[PDB]
Subunit: 101 residues, 3 copies
């Protein structure tokens, strides 16, 4: 298994493309996005991104860039969880996530 | 970053308003909810609720499970998280960036 | 609360039924699945499974069987998180989750 940080961004859908580009620019290998409802008839339609990064610093770069640019004007939350990646050709590279010495 | 508990509730879609009302009464500052499938495929719902304290998460969990989960299908679990940005979650005080 | 392992599988939607068969065959008590979008405009419709297991080996058996059968030919990521289950009759049994 490979150590990973899982960054979650829940925010307004209008920010989809701008947050996707930030993610791409960060060096993150991929991301998952989903339509969600949220509250912070009072529910609103939101999107949630999940991004697995190899380092906490990469996760924080994305979080910091999204927030500084958009979180004054747009609703949002960003949080981070620990995870271990078991399989993922781009995340772990060709030798896989359980390579030996 | 501010320590958080991420409470997740996966249950029958018909309980959406009922469960949102409990979350709204709890003191939690928000919630995300999404349409999902499952078995435990039926179309159901998943809530995620970030709370500042484990105690708030567990009060939500207890209230929801006792009121509904002997009569409706449901699972409730909790994960650790850290909040990096969140105006209402961390307050005007911010997410204590240097801790 | 009962310690649990949260296995996540994000992969191509066409594999929905093939993966669900594997989850069931592993002994897992259930799963959640949802429609997602992934990059890895260049977002393609895909699926995410979340599976809570009592043991780490059960989660890894699901992981190993899905990846070996499919990940040479289909895109995917599988990762794992700690969790605790608070309520869940099938997960915890009739005594509850403590
Ligand atoms: N405490 C929380 N727990 C879970 N989700 C949250 C929390 N606070 C805010 N959110 C999500 O972040 C979203 C921000 O935009 P909305 O307020 O439309 O809806 C909010 C919720 O979906
Ligand atoms: N062990 C598990 N892992 C992930 N999801 C679960 C598990 N057990 C139950 N569920 C989810 O919780 C839901 C409760 O309603 P269902 O029985 O319709 O469908 C269930 C699944 O989506
Ligand atoms: N680093 C990552 N973080 C979050 N999700 C990812 C990551 N890499 C791949 N994925 C997801 O795994 C999916 C595999 O199928 P796709 O390429 O269609 O889209 C991919 C993303 O949804």
């Amino acid at each position: 298994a490979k150590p990973a940080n899982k960054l979650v961004i829940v925010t307004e859908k209008i920010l989809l493309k701008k947050i996707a580009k930030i993610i791409d620019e960060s060096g993150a290998k991929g991301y998952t996005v989903m339509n969600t409802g949220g509250k912070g008839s009072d529910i609103e339609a939101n999107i949630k991104f999940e991004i697995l990064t190899e380092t906490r610093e990469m996760a924080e770069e994305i979080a910091d860039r999204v927030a500084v640019k958009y979180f004054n004007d747009y609703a949002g939350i960003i949080y981070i969880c620990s995870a271990e990646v078991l399989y993922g050709h781009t995340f772990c590279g060709p030798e896989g996530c359980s390579a030996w010495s």
